[PDB]
Amino acid sequence: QATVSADAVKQVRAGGKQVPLAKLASPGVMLLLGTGGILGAILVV
Amino acid sequence: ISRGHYLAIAADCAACHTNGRDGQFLAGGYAISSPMGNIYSTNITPSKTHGIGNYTLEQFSKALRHGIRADGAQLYPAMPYDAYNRLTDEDVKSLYAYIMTEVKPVDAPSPKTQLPFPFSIRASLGIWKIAARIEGKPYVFDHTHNDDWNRGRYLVDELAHCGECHTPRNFLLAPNQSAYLAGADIGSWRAPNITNAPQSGIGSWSDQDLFQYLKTGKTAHARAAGPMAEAIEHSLQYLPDADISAIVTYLRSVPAKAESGQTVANFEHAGRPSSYSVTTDGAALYEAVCASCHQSDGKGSKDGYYPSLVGNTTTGQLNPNDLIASILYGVDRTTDNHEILMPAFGPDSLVQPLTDEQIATIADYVLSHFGNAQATVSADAVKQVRAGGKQVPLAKLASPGVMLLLGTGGILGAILVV
Amino acid sequence: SISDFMQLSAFATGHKNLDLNIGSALLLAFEAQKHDFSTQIKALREHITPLHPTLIQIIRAWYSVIEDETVYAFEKALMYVVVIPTYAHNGPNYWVS
Amino acid sequence: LSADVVIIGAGICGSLLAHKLVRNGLSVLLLDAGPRRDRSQIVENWRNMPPDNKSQYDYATPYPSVPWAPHTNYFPDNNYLIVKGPDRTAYKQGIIKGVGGTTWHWAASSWRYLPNDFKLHSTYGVGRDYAMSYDELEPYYYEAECEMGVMGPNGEEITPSAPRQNPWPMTSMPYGYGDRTFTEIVSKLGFSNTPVPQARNSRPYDGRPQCCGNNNCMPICPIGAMYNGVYAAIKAEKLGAKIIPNAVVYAMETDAKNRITAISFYDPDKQSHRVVAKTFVIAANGIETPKLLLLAANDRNPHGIANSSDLVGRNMMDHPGIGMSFQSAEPIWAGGGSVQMSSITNFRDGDFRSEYAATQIGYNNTAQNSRAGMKALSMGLVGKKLDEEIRRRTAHGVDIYANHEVLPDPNNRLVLSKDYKDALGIPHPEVTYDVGEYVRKSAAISRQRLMDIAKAMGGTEIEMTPYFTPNNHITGGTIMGHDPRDSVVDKWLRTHDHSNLFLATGATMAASGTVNSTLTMAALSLRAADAILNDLK
Ligand SMILES: Cc1cc2nc3c(=O)[nH]c(=O)nc-3n(C[C@H](O)[C@H](O)[C@H](O)COP(=O)(O)OP(=O)(O)OC[C@H]3O[C@@H](n4cnc5c(N)ncnc54)[C@H](O)[C@@H]3O)c2cc1C
Ligand code: HEC
Ligand code: HEC
Ligand code: HEC
Ligand code: F3S
């Protein structure tokens, strides 16, 4: 039943699949969320 | 011809409303590339069912000038209605007579525009133009300048909408009044600076050359390519000589906007002679493709059919976007029903396909020996041109991942207040 | 050892302009062809101021690549490039240049 | 490898058929022995090709010869093609192998055959007439002409020729000085000069530049103004077809029902691979398709695939040409325009065709600069005198050909001889080509006419070849016919014995005709496209 894809090995080399939490550990993502918090402050005003 | 027919020809109205030459003119269904995606032009023939046959003078002007449709939806900014804002109402009503009387209506639909969120909701564009401050009082004939400059300003800014293709944009994709007619990327191609700047614009062009270029698109120092080929073969070539002369006079009064470190005019930059040792060679690979139509020294044809790559505005720009787009797509102009064509050299080329690395190799060579030596082309620079230029900062939000990330941020604020 | 081959024959019996460095390519190819190629060419200058009333083999550097005293005799009437309306009533007839 | 319709040979016929089929939707795989070849590389090779091979026309040196499946070259040959017989030199024709096929190089001359030629057997009782008539192929002629973008003299009545239901997509580009001088002198002599319909863009067409007179139609054009099979190959590949280079098809596994099931092809390193598709199509060459059929003999068919009548390899035709070379008294200035613009088509039809072949006079417009230059160099002149000598020889240099109509003779054959091999062990094709007294009398008449032309033009240093020259288009080898017991393929581009095999190539051609005519191969290939459709609809 088990079957191995070409990119399945590539994931193991990099350290397995990226956990959903780790995507937030990139400078791009926090900047996107930083603006969202700014939106709320102006929204209340 | 009809008075409205002249403006319709002048205003490039038939260019975007026919799918190439095959489709019926003014019938819509023509795809135009935008960073947000593809916006399809809707039919304009006065069809009572599937066209705009129910349009009236009050609402036809509103759709043309202020860009709101009959239903109440906001027309996409792809229309030059921001350019058409200054269009005088006495001239707009002339278009309505032309649309209803001249063009034969067709009961044929056109595909609808589909864009990802948040561009899916049409009414969101109402806020967009408010930040862009389109209005925009109707044009009134200027008095401090002669009658010729008055008509020249009429054709360029609002009639032929030359600005919307030349002047740059901002993060919100709106016209930039500070850098007026400065030149910015348009999808794959790039309109150059056309201000009165002597060394960085088109000021160094002779006035006779400028009039000839806008009339046909063919001059010894520059040839119209890409969108200008569509611009010339559709609208400008039919204009009267006085109006084209009026355009030249106006273009001489636009204030100069210099670029980032330009020393000599693009067409005034000469080239150094070179040859090749009789793959992956700038001199050799350029000779295997270009040496026939042009020459080995880049001087082109003797009489002027093939362009001289030395002192050429397409090669004299610091940004090689025009030169890379010239290789990737080729030029195809049509003056007075006399077509001149250059075969495409992209991955989907029919004559001989060049990969992105290959195109950079010739682009490096031609710029080094015939174009501006300062200019340099990278391997991925060609790849950006194939995809439609660099992604605009606003377009990154047009992905389902980004909106989900921002969606949680709004949720955070609601709980934060509690 | 290059300018001597460049001016080997004459200005009139050859090119008034330069060879555009094809002579350097030609000379470097002749090195494998003839070891004594570099020795005979220098002596030829003094003889004109024996070699070619009887000895013709010295013309291999003159025949050769066509280079038939080349960019051609008539490049203004025949192709190898030119404008599409190439027909202009044969241009000239026998005006060499 | 699995497909729906497999087409072998990505030339004019294979690529046009694949383009039409993928337009119709059903998937098509193109397998070709040659590699993926680019036009720019061939232009570079021709420019760097030794110029001595330009003086005498060479159309294979720029094109690389792959070791596993070499294409024949006629400057000293690699012995890929062996010719036997009294006029073995008549079949000294060359081909180029690779994606785009031999259509990578060709004079762009696309022609429509006379209506009489389709009923040649029923008209003059010689050879085998075509299965279909002119009216049964004219729409496909127009379709192929539109696809390839042919030129044509629309606004002039010329001579008894092929009637047209719709004028040519383009208009004949104006003559140079050489063509005008030749036309006026032959009109004074008594011969009518007619423009040749060429697959050249007189105006921009199908995203390709206008013909700029590079005068290098053969063997490679730097800009692509003329038409090549690579265009249709690329169009088909983009539309959805899958094309594989270096696919040397050698054997086909057939059954007792004569419907083929599998095809095996060698790579350069002998690795065989099997491909299965509903319908199998072979479009190689008039010289390669019969060879492949003979090579693929299996248990069911001992003497060859689809050979219940044993006519493969037989009835080979190729137009015999009589060359000419001399210097005119007055400056012809030949070289302007394309390599082949005008021709004498007055003798293409008549009542005399029942006794001798219809002569097709017409000269070559290739530039004389290289040949004249090396002729003057061989005179030993040096300097200014050499300059006037090269001037005279390139302003008076003239070359004329004179084609003929060679009839199908079953004595001719395509025995794939075992004496000479190749890298993969595939036998080198060998052709025994016979001419017959028909073309002998026709060639005598052509020689008389060529002497007349030379005397009218004041020719000097006249050297006509003493042997019949080739014309590089292979006609016949797999002859059509309504009767399966005297012909091998039917009226619908189908092998009689193998119902599941559709053959569309110059081998299928039935009569040699008068003119340089790969267009009919294009028309028949497009004709076979409907056969693909109804077979899978
Ligand atoms: C000099 C010249 C003049 C011409 N003049 C004219 C003219 O006047 N008028 C005109 O209409 N046309 C003219 N033509 C065009 C010519 O008629 C066509 O281009 C030709 O018939 C098409 O062949 P092709 O290129 O499609 O064959 P290709 O596509 O090259 O054939 C490839 C096939 O060969 C097979 N093959 C190759 N090697 C092997 C092997 N070892 N074992 C097994 N299979 C093998 C492959 O598997 C494949 O099936 C001219 C061409 C030339 C070169
Ligand atoms: C290409 C840049 C265009 C030119 C030039 C003109 N129009 Fe246009 N128009 C264009 C698009 C892409 C759209 C629809 C996008 C949107 O935001 O919905 C439109 C819309 C109209 C309409 C609205 C009704 C309709 O059925 O689309 C009208 C009445 C209209 N355009 C008229 C019009 C006229 C009169 C033009 C000549 C000055 C003209 N358009 C130019 C694209 C383009
Ligand atoms: C003949 C078939 C051509 C070949 C091969 C190449 N080019 Fe070309 N190019 C050609 C024409 C006829 C034109 C202009 C249209 C006219 O009416 O003048 C061009 C244009 C360009 C340009 C821009 C010139 C201008 O628009 O002002 C560039 C930079 C250019 N061509 C470059 C170029 C390169 C790099 C080529 C090798 C890949 C090449 N061209 C091939 C004709 C032909
Ligand atoms: C968008 C469709 C355009 C409109 C409307 C106008 N122009 Fe344009 N122009 C455009 C492009 C994409 C290009 C560059 C083509 C290339 O070779 O890269 C140009 C070019 C010019 C030039 C040449 C300047 C130079 O190359 O340095 C001039 C003088 C010019 N355009 C003027 C001009 C005028 C006066 C217009 C109003 C009628 C106009 N353009 C409209 C794109 C578009
Ligand atoms: S290859 Fe092309 S442009 Fe003219 S002469 Fe030969 S056609």
On whether the CB atoms of residues B175 and B82 are closer than 8 A, the answer is: yes
On whether the CB atoms of residues D416 and D428 are closer than 8 A, the answer is: yes
Provide the residue range defining the domain that includes D251: 1-537
Q: What is the largest CA-CA distance in chain C?
A: 52
Taking CB atoms and an 8 Å limit, are B305 and C84 in contact across chains? yes
Taking CB atoms and an 8 Å limit, are B278 and C81 in contact across chains? no
Q: Which two tokens stand for residue A36?
A: 């969202």
Question: Could you give the C-alpha distances from B150 to B248, D328, D522, in angstroms and in order?
Answer: 12, 66, 60
Taking CB atoms and an 8 Å limit, are D39 and B352 in contact across chains? yes
CB B12 near ligand 2, within 6 Å: yes
Q: Which two tokens stand for residue C8?
A: 């080997």
Q: Which two tokens stand for residue D143?
A: 């379709």
Beta bridge partners of B22: none
Distance C81 CA to ligand 5 centre (A): 10
CB D216 near ligand 5, within 6 Å: yes
Residue A19: count other Cβ atoms within 10 Å of its Cβ.
8
Please report residues of D whose CB lies closer than 8 A to that of B344.
207
Q: Pairing between strand D5-8 and D28-31?
A: parallel
In this complex, which chains have at least 3 CB pairs below 8 Å with chain C? B, D
On whether the CB atoms of residues B238 and B11 are closer than 8 A, the answer is: no
Determine if residue D176 is left, alpha or beta; phi over 0 gives left, psi from -120 to 50 gives alpha, anything else beta: beta
On whether the CB atoms of residues D155 and D342 are closer than 8 A, the answer is: no
Check the CA dihedral B9-B14-B15-B16 and report its sign: positive
In this complex, which chains have at least 3 CB pairs below 8 Å with chain A? B
Q: Pairing between strand D193-195 and D501-503?
A: unpaired
How far is D118 from D130, CA to CA, in rounded Å?
Answer: 5
Distance D228 CA to ligand 1 centre (A): 11
Among A30, A31, A33, most B C-beta atoms within 10 A, so best to mutate, is: A33
Question: Could you give the C-alpha distances from D225 to B351, D211, D215, D221, in angstroms and in order?
Answer: 9, 5, 11, 7
| Cα B5 versus chain centre, distance | 22
Taking CB atoms and an 8 Å limit, are B305 and C83 in contact across chains? yes
Taking CB atoms and an 8 Å limit, are B301 and C22 in contact across chains? no
Task: Please provide the DSSP assignment of D284-325 as one string.
Answer: --TTTHHHHHHHT--SS-SS-TT-SS--TT-S-B---B--EE
What are the two backbone dihedrals, phi and then psi, of residue B395, each rounded to the nearest 5 degrees?
Answer: -65, -20
Distance B2 CA to ligand 2 centre (A): 21
Instruction: Give me the total of CB pairs closer than 8 Å, taking one residue from chain C and one from chain D.
Output: 95
Residues 6+ apart with CB under 8 A from D406: D90, D317, D318, D319, D320, D357, D435, D436, D438, D439, D475, D512
Q: Which two tokens stand for residue B205?
A: 């062009």
Residues 6+ apart with CB under 8 A from B209: B219, B220, B221, B222
Please report residues of D whose CB lies closer than 8 A to that of C13.
382-384
Q: Pairing between strand D324-327 and D397-403?
A: antiparallel
Residues 6+ apart with CB under 8 A from D270: D424
On whether the CB atoms of residues B243 and B148 are closer than 8 A, the answer is: no
Beta bridge partners of D363: D400
How far is B379 from B357, CA to CA, in rounded Å?
Answer: 5
Three-state SS for D338?
Answer: coil
**Angle D361-D362-D366 from CA coordinates, rounded to 5°:** 155
Which of D93, D96, D131 minimizes the C-alpha distance to D12?
Answer: D96
Residue D473 bears catalytic tag: yes
- Chains D vs B: touching, with 3+ CB pairs under 8 Å? yes
Please report residues of B whose CB lies closer than 8 A to that of A41.
413
On whether the CB atoms of residues D475 and D314 are closer than 8 A, the answer is: no
On whether the CB atoms of residues D460 and D327 are closer than 8 A, the answer is: yes
Q: Which two tokens stand for residue B352?
A: 């001989």
Taking CB atoms and an 8 Å limit, are C80 and D215 in contact across chains? yes
Cis check for the bond before B136: say yes or no (omega within 30 of 0): yes
Report the nearest atom of ligand 4 relative to the CA of B266: 27
Question: Could you give the C-alpha distances from B279 to D44, D48, D186, in angstroms and in order?
Answer: 10, 14, 48
How far is D525 from B374, CA to CA, in rounded Å?
Answer: 53
CB B96 near ligand 2, within 6 Å: no
Establish whether B16 is an annotated binding residue.
Answer: yes
User: Which residue is catalytic, options D473, D482, D496, D498?
Assistant: D473
On whether the CB atoms of residues D473 and D513 are closer than 8 A, the answer is: no
> Exposure string (b/e) for B207-221, b if CB count within 10 Å is 16 or more?
eebbbbbbbbbbbeb
Taking CB atoms and an 8 Å limit, are B409 and A29 in contact across chains? no
Cis check for the bond before D160: say yes or no (omega within 30 of 0): no
Which of D37, D96, D39, D101 minimizes the C-alpha distance to D70?
Answer: D96
Starting at the edge strand found earlier in the chain, the sheet holding D342-344 runs D193-195, D342-344, D360-364, D397-403, D324-327
Number of domains in chain D: 1
How far is B395 from B397, CA to CA, in rounded Å?
Answer: 5
Residues 6+ apart with CB under 8 A from C71: none
Establish whether D11 is an annotated binding residue.
Answer: yes
Q: What is the 3-state secondary structure (H, E, C) of chain B?
A: CCHHHHHHHHCCHHHHCECCCCCCCCCECCEEEECCEEEECCCCCCCCCCCCCCCCHHHHHHHHHHCECCCCCECCCCCCCCCHHHCCHHHHHHHHHHHHHCCCCCCCCCCCCCCCCCCCCHHHHHHHHHHHCCCCCCCCCCCCCCHHHHHHHHHHHHHCCHHHHHCCCCCCCCCCCCCCCCCCEECCEECCCCCCCCCCCCCCCCHHHHHHHHHHCECCCCECCCHHHHHHHHCHHHCCHHHHHHHHHHHCCCCCCCCCCCCCCCCCCCCCCCCCCCCCCHHHHHHHHCCCCCCCCCCCCCCCCCCCCCCCCCCCCCCCHHHHHHHHHCCEEEECCEEEECCCCCCCCCCCCCCHHHHHHHHHHHHHHCCCCCCCCCHHHHHHHHHCCCCCHHHHHCCHHHHHHHHHHHHHHHHHHC
- Resolution of the structure in the document, Å: 3.8
On whether the CB atoms of residues D380 and C85 are closer than 8 A, the answer is: no
Q: Which two tokens stand for residue D353?
A: 């065709």
How far is D70 from D79, CA to CA, in rounded Å?
Answer: 10
Q: Which residue has the tokens 């010729």?
A: B148
Question: Could you give the C-alpha distances from B378 to B302, B321, B363, D407, in angstroms and in order?
Answer: 32, 11, 9, 60
Question: Could you give the C-alpha distances from D228 to D33, D233, D519, in angstroms and in order?
Answer: 18, 9, 12
How far is D241 from B138, CA to CA, in rounded Å?
Answer: 56
Cis check for the bond before D219: say yes or no (omega within 30 of 0): yes
Which of D443, D18, D385, D352 minimizes the C-alpha distance to D160?
Answer: D352
How far is D31 from D98, CA to CA, in rounded Å?
Answer: 10
Q: Considering only residues 10 to 39 of chain C, which have any Cβ-Cβ distance to chain B shorter than 8 Å?
A: 20-22, 25
Please report residues of B whose CB lies closer than 8 A to that of D204.
332, 339-341
Which ligand number lies closest to the CA of residue B204? 4
Which of D56, D9, D148, D18 minimizes the C-alpha distance to D528?
Answer: D18
Question: Could you give the C-alpha distances from B172 to B119, B168, B403, B409, B410, in angstroms and in order?
Answer: 13, 11, 17, 21, 21
Distance B385 CA to ligand 4 centre (A): 18
Q: Which two tokens stand for residue B216?
A: 């046909």
Which of B223, B370, B346, B224 minimizes the C-alpha distance to B283?
Answer: B370
Which ligand number lies closest to the CA of residue B259? 4
Q: Which two tokens stand for residue D45?
A: 């090779």
Torsion angle of C-alpha atoms D94, D97, D99, D102, degrees rounded to 10? 10
On whether the CB atoms of residues B230 and B289 are closer than 8 A, the answer is: no
Pocket test for ligand 4, best of B228, B250, B253, B327 (most atoms within 8 A of CB): B228
How far is D234 from D241, CA to CA, in rounded Å?
Answer: 9
| Cα B123 versus chain centre, distance | 26
Which value, in Å, is the radius of gyration of the alpha carbons in chain D? 22
On whether the CB atoms of residues B42 and B73 are closer than 8 A, the answer is: no
On whether the CB atoms of residues D318 and D470 are closer than 8 A, the answer is: yes
With 0-12 / 13-18 / 19 or more C-beta atoms within 10 angstroms meaning exposed / middle / buried, residue B55 is: buried
Which of B162, B160, B149 minimizes the C-alpha distance to B8?
Answer: B160
How far is B331 from B342, CA to CA, in rounded Å?
Answer: 5
Establish whether B162 is an annotated binding residue.
Answer: yes
Residues 6+ apart with CB under 8 A from B204: B198, B265, B267, B268
Distance D422 CA to ligand 1 centre (A): 19
Q: What is the largest CA-CA distance in chain D?
A: 76
CB D202 near ligand 5, within 6 Å: no
Provide the shortest C-alpha distance from residue A25 to chain B (in Å).
13
Please report residues of C whose CB lies closer than 8 A to that of B278.
22, 25
Please report residues of A whose CB lies closer than 8 A to that of B413.
36-37, 39-41, 43-44
On whether the CB atoms of residues B284 and B296 are closer than 8 A, the answer is: no
Question: Could you give the C-alpha distances from C52 to C31, C62, C64, in angstroms and in order?
Answer: 21, 12, 17
DSSP D377: H
Q: Using a 6 Å CB cutoff, which residues line ligand 4?
A: B 156, 160-162, 165-166, 186, 189-192, 194, 202, 213-214, 222, 225-228, 231, 236, 247, 251, 266, 313-314, 322
Q: Which two tokens stand for residue C91?
A: 């241009």
How far is C84 from B292, CA to CA, in rounded Å?
Answer: 12
Establish whether B234 is an annotated binding residue.
Answer: no
Q: Pairing between strand D242-244 and D397-403?
A: unpaired
Instruction: Give me the total of CB pairs closer than 8 Å, taking one residue from chain B and one from chain C.
Output: 15
Question: Could you give the C-alpha distances from B184 to B236, B357, B372, B402, D121, in angstroms and in order?
Answer: 21, 24, 19, 26, 70
Check the CA dihedral B373-B378-B379-B384 and report its sign: negative
Which value, in Å, is the radius of gyration of the alpha carbons in chain B? 23
CB D200 near ligand 5, within 6 Å: yes
